């Protein structure tokens, strides 16, 4: 086509979706990771994660307001990944990289799994 | 912070949100523009438009599944703007610029209003 494109549009949209999350506006699911609870928007979760895409395209699970993750999942790892979904920024540290990579494999977030593998390889 | 950032994340999220729209997955509102109907995600509309942000933060309107726009709004202009919300690309043409600018003013989409004003000024 002959469209023009606003370079910052996608980043500005994501910033506004994170502001809605902050302010608990139109959040429609609670993700439970053992004793912790995280409120989010199903569409953002599906857009970032192959696991959430599969969950919320299921004709029964699409209607659930609570999703319980596998008890082996680390709440801090999940929190770091949820923040990445809404901001593009990943708080990857020596002390959390193993939990973050394991969580990203479970959530099916291939680009995160990729940077974790590279950071681990560099320290070996 | 000491975060790393994935450059393409925001664009990839927006591409996936447009794929959900295409496939009518988790759309939660119908926008009526006279005889036409457009299905969308409230959160994407709020993230792009000051008018939708105000509508869906209202304690009563947040719960509506149908929103009727002012009868003066052009359906093609709305369609072009809805596509822009989900893709960052604006199909601005000599034949639609007046309707697109009027619709963007109504929807409170300041960057679109800005490029329309500039394109109009250049032809004068």
């Amino acid at each position: 086509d002959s469209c023009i494109q606003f370079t910052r549009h996608a980043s500005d949209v994501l910033l506004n979706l994170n502001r809605l999350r902050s302010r608990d506006i139109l959040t429609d699911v609670v993700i439970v990771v053992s004793r912790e609870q995280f409120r989010a928007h199903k569409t953002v979760l599906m857009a970032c994660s192959g696991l959430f895409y599969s969950i919320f395209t299921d004709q029964l699970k699409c209607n659930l307001s609570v999703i319980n993750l596998d008890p082996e999942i680390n709440p801090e790892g999940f929190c770091i990944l949820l923040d990445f979904m809404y901001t593009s920024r990943l708080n990857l540290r020596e002390g959390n990289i193993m939990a973050v990579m394991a969580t990203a494999m479970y959530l099916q977030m291939e680009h995160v799994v990729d940077t974790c593998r590279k950071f681990i390889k560099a320290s070996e | 912070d000491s975060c790393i950032q994935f450059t393409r994340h925001a664009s990839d999220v927006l591409l996936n949100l447009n794929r959900l729209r295409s496939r009518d997955i988790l759309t939660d509102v119908v926008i009526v523009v006279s005889r036409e109907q457009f299905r969308a995600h409230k959160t994407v509309l709020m993230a792009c438009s000051g008018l939708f942000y105000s509508i869906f933060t209202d304690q009563l309107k947040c719960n509506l599944s149908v929103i009727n726009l002012d009868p003066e709004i052009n359906p093609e202009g709305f369609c072009i703007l809805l596509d822009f919300m989900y893709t960052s690309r604006l199909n601005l043409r000599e034949g639609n610029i007046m309707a697109v600018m009027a619709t963007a003013m109504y929807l409170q989409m300041e960057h679109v209003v800005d490029t329309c004003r500039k394109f109009i000024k250049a032809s004068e």
């Binding site: 469209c3 023009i4 494109q5 606003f6 370079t7 | 690309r89 604006l90 960057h111 490029t115």
Partner: peptide, 4 residues
Amino acid sequence: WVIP
């Protein structure tokens, strides 16, 4: 705004 750019030509994509």
